[model samples]
Target: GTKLDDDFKEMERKVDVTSRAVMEIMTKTIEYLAHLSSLLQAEALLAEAMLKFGRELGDDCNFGPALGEVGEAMRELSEVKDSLDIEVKQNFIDPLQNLHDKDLREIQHHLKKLEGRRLDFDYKKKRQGKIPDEELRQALEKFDESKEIAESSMFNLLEMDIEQVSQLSALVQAQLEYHKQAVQILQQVTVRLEERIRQA
Candidate 1:
């Protein structure tokens, strides 16, 4: 408290909350992705059933071929869904997790040390008359060391804001490409339907 700045304390507070928010958001996003992937897997399995039924129908019926095409299209969509899952984890999730594990831990590590030193100083400072002067001086020195470390560690978190931004951008980019593939798959199915239409 003696040498620690109010601004530095505020910085630590803000970063603390930010980590909670960041970790929470990441957890939500991963849960969402897992659900989407589960649905995609389910749909893909349904597609296989369709493909099986269509093939069994011997192309003699009008609807069999149509169902078959839909199955193929859906299966392709599922492939891209899996690909997106991989890309997102690699490009977005893992990077953010790294920051949480390593960078965030550093700040917290110093924070705990600072608090420990602060406690030590407060206890020793209270015993000023009883304890030797050198003891009080030693306590303050240790507190200052931790205080300086914690302040700089907080700065690293704030400064690495761009890294988070970059990971966010990567997530969207992966999604965009996934969507792009989706459109192409759908377009192919549309053209197949048109050919069937002309024949029918």
Candidate 2:
């Protein structure tokens, strides 16, 4: 408490809660964006196949199943994309870019989610308020539980042959590396915020 002056202490109090909320919103929004992106990529592939069938074979090629699936996929993706866009504008892009002086923790959390950072908003939240310990602990416990499932699922389902698996591994590794950068930055922000809170 003695280490921080009034301005820093005030920043600590105001910024912590606001930044946590924004980070949670932005993190979920970014995750939804990535999910939408993956769906779009899948739909695009299907669309491209349909196009190829139409052009090469000069026929509709009975695309009924693909058509329905891709259409639904696209619609769902658009819905999620639209909602997340709104959240980003309200919670992240707008606030950070226009509404306020961007807090480091918020900025880092945003980057982490967008880039695939391993640490999440809950991580920062857990480090802060003592009141949320039980809920946050349960949330983190569930996250870890899902992580195991993800590892199993990704490896079991996504693994192709040797060459393809190698390529997939490389791609995943790249994404994870980018995520790590975000994680490190956000964790630094977390550390700084914790220190500030203590000082305050």
Candidate 3:
């Protein structure tokens, strides 16, 4: 309601919308990874059972070692799943949560304070001649101060888009690294599995 111009208001509004969506996305991804490790653990355990089954079949088995090694690889990936959760929370969640908890929150508080100051200024002016002259003068000063404070902080936040993008890229990097390790482990185990099949 205060003189937030046009472009500034729209950008601030967009920040509110975008940030809420981003928070949900990052949170869900965290939860996704959190539970994913357990899922991987279950798969690894199932593969261990396969290993046991192959051992029981002894020379009668052709595929037991194949399944056994693959299960071991699954356990390795599950271990990385735990590391992925740690990496994501440290890289992605920490900064974004800090933004929400610190900068955005302060901006909202400052914006609220500006609104209250504007209303106070309006009330005192409307009652002109009833309130002391110094009181009305002081009201204008406080309102102007709040306006300047709010705008500077708001501008600071708007310019943070680049840094936000950088953090987003960091998140992708963690995933890329994690998946590369996953591929490396699985490839090693599967390649060995293939050799066994060829021998058969």
Candidate 4:
């Protein structure tokens, strides 16, 4: 009985661990996405400011700092991509695989063992004595809890994949749009500056 109780508790702990791991992955992904958005906005503002400075000062101004800002933005974008790639593989893919392959299998294995014990108890009760209602109740309760945990864990994992892909797509699309707008603004400003230089 004690062994059975220990097995149930251990199964519960496995499910809880997987759930916590998925949550931590999601939280880190969200924080990185937010950081990427901030970088995009900063890059756009820097481009706008550089164009304004050029418009006022003409060719007499240094372009080094402005070019450096653009370079920095590009470097940051590459870094974010690299970081995200590593995170998805390490946190999301690996953990999902581990849960599916190891934890879920272990839970099912325990369930089978518990079911065998339950069957033996029922058989003995039919021949000789009564099975305690509390014993049966607790066993079934643990089984149900284990089933619920496995189902919920699988659902959460699937949702995490969908959400991660969807959010990444949206973020990249938004970033592309931001880049286009920033480039257009700079292009228009450059054309105006060119005309000013030609007239001078």
Candidate 5:
């Protein structure tokens, strides 16, 4: 029983640590990805403006090729944004909800059971002569088992949360860099168009 209690405590500590890690990473992931998405949206608008302005300038400006590149980049950015929207919803929202629905709630249920058993045990102990020895023993045993179950459930949830957030971070990071590259290309396209105009 002492060893089980020690194991339970250790599990509790691990869950706490993993929970904090998931929270911090998840927050940063959502914030950074959202900002990236917004920038990509802005890029699409820039592409639209460039397409219109380039047409207005006509053939002498030689802006056609540069504007075309911007259009393609903008299209890719929109595709990436659409895909990332699904990824963010699935990777972040669904998993978090599952953790709460499946694991955390299970742990809460078990802990409540343990609490109820402890109350019974304490009450019986205070009654002293009224409760039978066997009844007291049963209550104590049930309480300990429930404690172990609750701790184990919590640890499992924490492990899942850690994995979920780590995967999300990696996916978002890759997409972020990819979009940054696209934006960079768009920047270069704009620069080339400007150079042509200045030369003209």
Candidate 6:
């Protein structure tokens, strides 16, 4: 048997411990953020549904703070996820590009707050204002479909490839682009429904 040095064994132990710690931290943070993100989406959906069925339901729990928590968790996890290059784009400079362009904080900012999608607030009225049950139901159904599409986008982002940057930056970039679109869908749905609820 080869004589193993104590110093080498000590170094190996240190490396193993450090690598394990890094992996554990990365995994836990991703899991935590993922869970929080799901919660946020669910809360948003519930809020929208309640708004749609406003007459059928009473005042329910608000979702703004729940969404804000998810945003904060996502921002913190983005720091860790980016550091680990978990969902990185290639060019080795892509991460730098992301930082320069400010995608991370921007996503969080939009995710945390709902904004209007219309030039004015009366788009829902054109679809159908108060008084007609059929129009209200039809408009709400369309809004719900849009909200589901938005949620699907969030699902894609949560399940995106984390390890294939070397073979295809374009593919990863495409996915990232779609992910942004998904967020936009979510934001639009939130705004549209919020207005609908005000009328409801």
Q: Which candidate is the best by lDDT?
A: 1
Q: Give lDDT tens digits, candidate 6, residues 1-200.
A: 11224753454354344334434544564565566456655655554554455434433533443343343434443333343333433433344344324433343333323122221123554645454767555555654454344334333333342422332454456447546745654565566557645765
Worst window of 10 by summed lDDT in candidate 6: 112-121
Write the number of the candidate with greater TM-score, choosing between 1 and 5: 1
TM-score per prediction, in order, is 0.94, 0.30, 0.88, 0.39, 0.68, 0.28
Put down candidate 5 lDDT per residue, 1-200, tens digits, no spaces: 12336766677777666555556656676777787678768877886776667677664536665566566666666666766666775767566656656665677687678778778777777766788888878878887777767867877776666576576675766568667756775687678767767877
Candidate 1, residues 1-200: lDDT per residue as tens digits?
34567898789788988789779978988998899899889979998998988898879876799889988998989999999999998888888788889989888899999999999899888889999999999999998898888888888788778878888899999999999999999999999989988898
Q: Mind giving the per-residue lDDT tens digits that candidate 3 earns over 85-175? A: 7888888888888888888888888888988999998999999899999999999999999878878887887787788888889889888
The order by descending lDDT is 1, 3, 5, 4, 2, 6
lDDT of 1: 0.88
- lDDT of candidates 1 onward, in order: 0.88, 0.46, 0.80, 0.55, 0.68, 0.43
Task: For model 1, give the 10-residue run with minimal summed lDDT.
Answer: 1-10
Error of 6 at 185 (Å): 22
Q: In model 6, how large is the Cα lDDT of residue 131?
A: 42
TM-score, predicted candidate 1 vs. hidden true structure:
0.94
What tens digits encode model 2's per-residue C-alpha lDDT throughout 9-70? 45444445554554565557467667656765675566566545545554343344334334
RMSD (Cα, Å) for all candidates, in order, is 1.5, 25.7, 2.1, 10.4, 4.5, 32.8
Candidate 5: where is the Cα deviation over 4 Å?
1-4, 155-200
Better of 3 and 6 by lDDT: 3
The order by descending TM-score is: 1, 3, 5, 4, 2, 6
